[PDB]
Amino acid sequence: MKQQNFCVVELLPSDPEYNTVASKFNQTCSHFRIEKIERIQNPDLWNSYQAKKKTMDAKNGQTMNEKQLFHGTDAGSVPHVNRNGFNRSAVAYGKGTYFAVNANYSANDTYSRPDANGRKHVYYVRVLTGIYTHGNHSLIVPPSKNPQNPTDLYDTVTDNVHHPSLFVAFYDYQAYPEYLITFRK
Ligand SMILES: NC(=O)c1cccc(NC(=O)CCC(=O)NCCc2cn(CCNS(=O)(=O)c3cccc(C(=O)O)c3)nn2)c1
Q: Which residue intervals define the domain PARP catalytic in the entry?
């Protein structure tokens, strides 16, 4: 809704942006080899991401609304995620998109399924986690904060509010696949 055409830009190992991303990945995934790291440049998707962030910022106070989190997926999904991000298109904590604090969660073969050539795919994603609570299975949206004021909902949900290892997001444009890590065993 807008075409959200994208460019994919490989970064070189010398690039500081490469190392920022590789370093975060390497905290838990050093034992894998990284074949490449790309930036996904999709200006329509980014513009719609930045619009929801502006809204979230003007609303959540001192809160750092954005976290950078990981998401493993199969090779088939990579061009979908590039065009559309994490679109509306079951589970423990709700029916939305799952993101992980630590790369080794996403690196599991059940998420980042290895292709024919053994390549695995993990995105390093800007996610608007905002204000979060503990989730549950039947959430098709996050719960309301106050029952007296029931339209202001939580922004995301999590497994553990003081020690999260995962977050679930439900809305469109709440997440931007800024980087794709292609790697192998
Ligand atoms: N993938 C990860 O790196 C990761 C990180 C933390 C936790 C988890 N996963 C879990 O704990 C269990 C995940 C699970 O059982 N189901 C989630 C999969 C799912 C997401 N959706 C939402 C539909 N929107 S969609 O466009 O098809 C979509 C959305 C987001 C990602 C994809 C994708 O291609 O990966 C697709 N429907 N099913 C994964």
A: 1-185
- The kind and range of the H/E element at 59 are helix 43-60
How far apart are the C-alpha atoms of 77 and 87, rounded to whole Å?
A: 12
* Nearest CA, atom 9, ligand 1: 98
Domains of the chain: 1-185 (3.90.228.10)
Compute, in angstroms, the gap from residue 61 CA to the centroid of ligand 1: 29
Residue of the CA atom closest to atom 37 of ligand 1: 96
Q: What does the alpha-carbon distance between residue 131 and residue 39 come to, in Å, rounded to a whole number?
A: 27
CB of 110 shorter than 6 A to ligand 1: no
Handedness of CA 82, 176, 119, 92 (dihedral sign): negative
Q: Which atom of ligand 1 is nearest to the CA of 93?
A: 11
DSSP symbols for 66-115? EEEEEEEE-TTTHHHHHHHTT-----SS-SSEEEESSHHHHHSTTTS---
Q: In angstroms, what is the span from residue 159 Cα to ligand 1's centroid?
A: 15
Establish whether residue 99 lines the binding site of ligand 1, counting it when its CB lies within 6 angstroms of any ligand atom: yes
Method used to determine the 3D structure: X-ray
Reported structure resolution in angstroms? 2.2
